[PDB]
Amino acid sequence: TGFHPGIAFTVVRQDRFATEQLLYAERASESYFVGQIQVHHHDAIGGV
Amino acid sequence: FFKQIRSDDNSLYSAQFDILLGTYCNTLNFVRFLELGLSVACICTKFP
Structure with missing residues (x-):
């Protein structure tokens, strides 16, 4: 309804970036x- | 395209083929009407 119930929050979010070391x-x-x-050899699909 | 040869490489050693083992035609017997014995009953004359 758009009412402020006398209490606030602190938002915590984490991102992820691509860098080059x-x-x-x-x-x-x-x-x-x-x-x-x-x-070492061991059989597989149609091939040794 | 096809990469799915992951060095599994089967069907790469197929050697089936199709062969043509020859052909056979024939000739036509060019019969001479005159060298028959039926022609002994008619007298043949040319008229251009």
């Missing part, structure tokens, strides 16, 4: 160990 990394900031390739 800018990454920077120092040399030799990562020790990285590589194992060995292993292969």
Whole structure:
């Protein structure tokens, strides 16, 4: 009806934006160990 | 277009075809009326 029942609210909403980051990394900031390739086969739809 | 070959690639090894194994026509026997024996009853004369 357009009546103010003597009480107010605080609206809280959250949005989501698409950005583009800018990454920077120092040399030799990562020790990285590589194992060995292993292969496995298992049937599927009309194909091995 | 069709991408749905997700390296499943079946029906890519179809080799069915259709062949024409030859044909056969014939000739017409050009009969000479005079070399019959019926012609012994008529006398043939040309008149241009």
